[PDB]
Amino acid sequence: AASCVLLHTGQKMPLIGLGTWKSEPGQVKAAIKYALTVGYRHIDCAAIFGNELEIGEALQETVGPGKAVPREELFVTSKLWNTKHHPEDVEPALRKTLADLQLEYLDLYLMHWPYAFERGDNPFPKNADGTIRYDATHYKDTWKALEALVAKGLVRALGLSNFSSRQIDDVLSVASVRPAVLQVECHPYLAQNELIAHCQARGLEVTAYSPLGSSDRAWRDPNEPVLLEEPVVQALAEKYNRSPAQILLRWQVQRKVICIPKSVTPSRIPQNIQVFDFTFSPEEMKQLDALNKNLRFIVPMLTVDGKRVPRDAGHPLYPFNDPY
Numbered sequence: 666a667a668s669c670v671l672l673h674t675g676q677k678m679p680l681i682g683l684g685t686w687k688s689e690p691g692q693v694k695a696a697i698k699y700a701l702t703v704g705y706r707h708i709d710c711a712a713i714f715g716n717e718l719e720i721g722e723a724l725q726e727t728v729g730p731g732k733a734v735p736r737e738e739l740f741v742t743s744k745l746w747n748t749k750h751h752p753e754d755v756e757p758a759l760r761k762t763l764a765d766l767q768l769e770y771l772d773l774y775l776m777h778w779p780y781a782f783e784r785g786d787n788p789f790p791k792n793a794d795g796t797i798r799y800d801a802t803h804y805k806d807t808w809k810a811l812e813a814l815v816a817k818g819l820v821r822a823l824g825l826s827n828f829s830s831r832q833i834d835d836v837l838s839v840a841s842v843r844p845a846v847l848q849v850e851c852h853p854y855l856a857q858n859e860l861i862a863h864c865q866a867r868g869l870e871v872t873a874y875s876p877l878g879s880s881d882r883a884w885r886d887p888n889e890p891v892l893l894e895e896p897v898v899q900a901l902a903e904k905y906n907r908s909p910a911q912i913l914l915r916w917q918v919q920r921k922v923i924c925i926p927k928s929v930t931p932s933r934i935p936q937n938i939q940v941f942d943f944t945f946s947p948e949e950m951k952q953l954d955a956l957n958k959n960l961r962f963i964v965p966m967l968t969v970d971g972k973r974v975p976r977d978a979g980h981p982l983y984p985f986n987d988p989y
């Protein structure tokens with residue numbers, strides 16, 4: 666039970682994938698192997714997560730010309746970190762990921778963010794005051810260097826992560842290799858309808874990260890409301906005899922949006938992919954659609970005067986200034 670969408674490159678990309686953000690080492694390995702046993706065929710990774718090494722070890726014993734899962738039947742994604750936007754660094758950054766992942770090619774390689782950070786070995790270049798010392802490379806230059814990778818057959822498809830509609834069109838206006846996927850935060854509170862309509866218009870499929878709301882991200886502490894716990898989600902969870910998260914994921918699945926739910930919990934892993942045997946009626950979709958309130962949770966902290974404000978909102982290539 667795992668449907669998929671067809672990318673413009675002709676690749677079959679499963680609607681459900683295994684997220685690995687914060688899936689620390691000594692934990693993601695166990696998660697990966699079990700996920701594969703339960704049907705997962707789509708794994709979502711990132712160099713910044715600092716766990717691709719352990720992921721490579723899991724795939725080294727579950728995927729191969731002998732294991733239970735053929736390499737070609739797996740869809741592996743990864744992303745180019747912000748400190749590797751300079752054209753020169755792009756291939757070394759990709760290769761490194763392949764080394765850690767122990768693969769010969771990625772099925773999808775995404776630019777993690779449209780804005781760059783000072784190049785170097787420090788994933789988070791700060792200075793004195795502790796502020797992030799950015800870089801000025803434009804995403805279009807990083808993108809052309811990313812295209813050379815598809816040429817060398819190191820990556821089958823390219824995509825964008827955290828890009829705005831304007832930035833997406835900016836890449837499309839000069840692309841020799843067109844983005845196949847747009848990965849953004851997406852769930853009932855941030856439905857991304859406008860962006861989704863935009864991508865459909867540009868031939869890009871949409872991947873939703875933090876589909877459950879990230880439960881509490883790597884930084885958050887409001888007080889309410891909580892995506893899970895919304896009465897509609899609970900009502901549907903009761904009606905279809907499924908967990909609140911399955912309801913959130915099914916919602917995305919039903920509207921053809923790819924989801925890469927993250928989990929290192931044995932009992933949730935199989936549940937997060939088991940969202941293909943039930944369906945919501947049009948009215949229930951409407952009810953879930955009504956939860957939309959253009960609210961995004963995956964943004965910075967850099968607390969200032971007892972106030973939470975975006976840390977990188979100052980970057981000229983910041984993706985969240987425009988409506989979408």
Ligand SMILES: NC(=O)c1ccc[n+]([C@@H]2O[C@H](COP(=O)([O-])OP(=O)(O)OC[C@H]3O[C@@H](n4cnc5c(N)ncnc54)[C@H](OP(=O)(O)O)[C@@H]3O)[C@@H](O)[C@H]2O)c1
Binds near residue numbers: 876878880910
């Ligand atoms: N491109 C980007 O910029 C970007 C950024 C961030 C993340 N991502 C990707 O998106 C993936 C998922 O996003 P996300 O991890 O932020 O959030 P998410 O998948 O919405 O939520 C993950 C949290 O939900 C819990 N959870 C998982 N399944 C559950 C279930 N069935 N019921 C209740 N709780 C459940 C997890 O706990 P346990 O693990 O303890 O089960 C974890 O604390 C990441 O792993 C990563 O691959 C991409």
